Amino acid sequence: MDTYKLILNGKTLKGETTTEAVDAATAEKVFKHYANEHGVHGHWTYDPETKTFTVTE
Numbered sequence: 001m002d003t004y005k006l007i008l009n010g011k012t013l014k015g016e017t018t019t020e021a022v023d024a025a026t027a028e029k030v031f032k033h034y035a036n037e038h039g040v041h042g043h044w045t046y047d048p049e050t051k052t053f054t055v056t057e
Contacts (some may be wrong), residue, residue, distance in 0.1 A: 001018070001020050001021070001022060001050055001054065002005050002021070003018055003019070003020055003023065003051060004018060004019055004020075004021055004027035004031070004052070004053065005007045005017075005018045005050065005051065005052040005053070006018070006027075006031040006034060006035070006052070006053045006054070006055065007053070007054040007055070008038060008040045008053075008055055009040075009042075009054060009055065009056040009057065010038070010039070010040035010057045011057045013038060013039070013040055015038070015040075016017075017031075017034060018032070024046065024048070024051070027051075027053070031053050032044075033057070034048065035038070035055045036043075038047060040055055040057060041055075042055055042057040043055070043056045044056075050052060053056075
């Protein structure tokens with residue numbers, strides 16, 4: 001297991017959350033929904049060194 005982080009770099013929301021997941025693609029799915037729930041929609045990147053996804057508006 002590991003901890004993954006999502007940074008939301010949104011037009012109105014700057015935010016973070018984390019999730020524990022078995023792999024990156026599992027965290028990704030969790031995060032894609034999370035971002036939509038929070039109305040942040042845009043460009044996705046993933047950085048394996050800090051196990052961090054960023055979604056940028």
